[PDB]
Amino acid sequence: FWLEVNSVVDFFTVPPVFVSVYLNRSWLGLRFLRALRLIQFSEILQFLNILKTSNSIKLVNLLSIFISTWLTAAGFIHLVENSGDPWENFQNNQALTYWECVYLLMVTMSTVGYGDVYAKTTLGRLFMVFFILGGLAMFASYVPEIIELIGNRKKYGGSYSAVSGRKHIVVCGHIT
Amino acid sequence: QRMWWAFLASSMVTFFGGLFIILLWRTLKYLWTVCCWMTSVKDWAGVMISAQTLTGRVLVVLVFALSIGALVIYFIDSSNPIESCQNFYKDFTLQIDMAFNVFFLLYFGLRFIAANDKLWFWLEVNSVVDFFTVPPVFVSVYLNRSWLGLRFLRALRLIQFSEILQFLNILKTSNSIKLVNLLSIFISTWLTAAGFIHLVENSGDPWENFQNNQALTYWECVYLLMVTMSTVGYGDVYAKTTLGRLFMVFFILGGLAMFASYVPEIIELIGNRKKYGGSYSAVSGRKHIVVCGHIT
Amino acid sequence: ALKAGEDKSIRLGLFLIISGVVSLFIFGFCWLSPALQDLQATEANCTVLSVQQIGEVFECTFTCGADCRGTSQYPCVQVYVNNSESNSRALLHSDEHQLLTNPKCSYIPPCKRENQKNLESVMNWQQYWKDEIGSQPFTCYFNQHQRPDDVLLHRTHDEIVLLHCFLWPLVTFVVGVLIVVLTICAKSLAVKAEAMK
Amino acid sequence: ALKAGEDKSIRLGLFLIISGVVSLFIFGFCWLSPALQDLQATEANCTVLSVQQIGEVFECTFTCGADCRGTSQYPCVQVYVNNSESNSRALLHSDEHQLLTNPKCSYIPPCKRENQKNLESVMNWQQYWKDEIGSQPFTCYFNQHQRPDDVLLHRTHDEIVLLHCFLWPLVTFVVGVLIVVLTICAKSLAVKAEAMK
């Protein structure tokens, strides 16, 4: 339990807020890691009976993994660009907003790469090389989406919604 | 003076001259019939410890670790404005590099005496890598001046890392050996190509008197190759020289559609599944049962 | 059962080990060229020869908050020293960043909203060095291996950032090997102690 | 057996041949436009008409080591010549790169850290040409086909780099065809000599 992912997310979110109120000074640290809590949104939709067919649960699970990973990676790049390389006395920092980092990750992972926004720091370059090599060819290059995009078809109906007042008939056997 | 050609010549002349004298020795050994101790110890004196024997780890495992050391020294050399005279004597520098390179020479000679065919051994890839790494260090200590030439070619020694992991019994299933072999081919090719581009950009086009050079670090070249081969292409860093453009066109046409567009990875990514277990790890004290026949 | 989770500790241990090692190599390659250069600057003894202005005027940028980018002038003071290690004249700069942002002048004032305050600041600095001419020698940083024309009052980096950068990845390597050792105990000595029940 | 490796020599030979040929074409297309232009400049005989300064002042950049980028002034000297091949006035420049980096002036000093040394260098150059007025004619490089207003003291390129660039790919082509010929012998004359045993 201690080294389960959600435990780690809690350790890197919760203690520094207590530090921040004891020192009475707010901090923009690793708090973006709370985005990983979106991973289990797939549970909420089935507990609330919004989602009731398994392939759609897998689809929303994969989609939430994508969105949460995108927002998390944008947080790391935001932190790493706004604080410069330490071997350059943090002088070479770049004043990106978090939304410029979200946009940069999108323009990069689609492999468009305009270069209107890009990572300047050495650490930023290192993170982008990792994110390109992990985002392509390990995080993408999934097969589930090509088998689950027909998921909304490979299941044919739940149960007949019998209205009152209308008569009703069942037909079975050799149907062609 | 900047006498770059003297270092390069030592590799060119040893490779092509050795090729000539092997071809001529063979040809004259044949034409001899138209005009009409030494052979024994080679089978053991190095071959007992070179490879595949029980404790013959050194002349594959250590030469690998030393090749990584030599490559790291090339990364150190690449971090300076190519004009520094403190990091040159009684620090580590060329004097520590020499200790790797003389071992490479001795190991090459051992391989040469062990060779079943001298010609096919001479133009084997690792022989070529040794010819373009080893002679210019001797030039550099005779002229007593360090050189940032083709030393990045030592990265090709990573190709056979797949052997080390099976000799040390770290890797024991064949598809994972193929996976690590392909991965090492990728990493070594990436670092090698980045070396060529680093050399070609930091020295300008000769038809422009080398004036149009670009001061890229080796790591900017590694990054450029990555941003290019993923086809992102920001253009924050790109090749400026004419030779750089030529190399990039070749690297794009060879990296895509010949070096990539492999099928092995799509059949070996399920490799960790298409094998189902090795052997049962029978603990002491626990009882144990086998079930077989029609299992469904 | 414990074993089904204990090897997660192995994986984490191993990750912390290799992460530490890789981090040490990465921080190595990028620190060493700056660090070498900044220690290649020797420390020497110096005394000022003369203090003067060359009459040339330079621009600076004042940030009046939130991306404000106004600009102001300042006059170019120059100061030169005797040098104990080269016994040749060299030009005093405050620090490497000051030399870099203007290699023509011995000082750059903290750029103010009005020219009169830049002026006054330069005079206030100049009159101090007009007293330090000859009297009370000082130590000076000097780089004859690559930049023999100039001297500095300070090094480029504070050593704490360098050593602080190197110790933590080593510490994470130590924590990694410690974690895998503790798990090796909690794997092997556990069954050795429990099988007796 | 030899044959299983001998065709690797064939492949390598063939590679060295086609590599040499392709390299000759590549170096051809990129050398020829510069080389043509630099030989289209004729060599002529010249004498200086007059030496003067136009009073205009130009900027230069001084590199005080390791990406230092300070700047200094210099005054614009102009020198004009009589021309044996055009019999019309033309303006003397030292070389094509000097003309390119400043087409307004006859000389550019090696840019120094202080204006007084740029000044002194320009005067030191000027006084030499104040003696070479009329006395002792000199050869001069001249390009009436495209730039008839100016003359140079030197060509743009040293011929060694051109010929050195062209000879080595030709040499590798020669080595390639030699290697394939030697292998053709070690293939055919080998079996012709060995089948008799």
PDB file of C-alpha atoms in Angstrom, chain C residues 23 63 81 83 140 184 188:
ATOM      1  CA  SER C  23      21.607  11.557 -12.786  1.00  0.00           C
ATOM      2  CA  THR C  63      12.000  46.771 -15.351  1.00  0.00           C
ATOM      3  CA  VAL C  81      45.155  46.953 -11.651  1.00  0.00           C
ATOM      4  CA  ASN C  83      48.681  41.853 -10.937  1.00  0.00           C
ATOM      5  CA  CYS C 140      41.374  39.354  -7.421  1.00  0.00           C
ATOM      6  CA  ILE C 184      16.618  -8.972   0.647  1.00  0.00           C
ATOM      7  CA  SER C 188      15.211 -14.332   2.991  1.00  0.00           C
TER       8      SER C 188
END
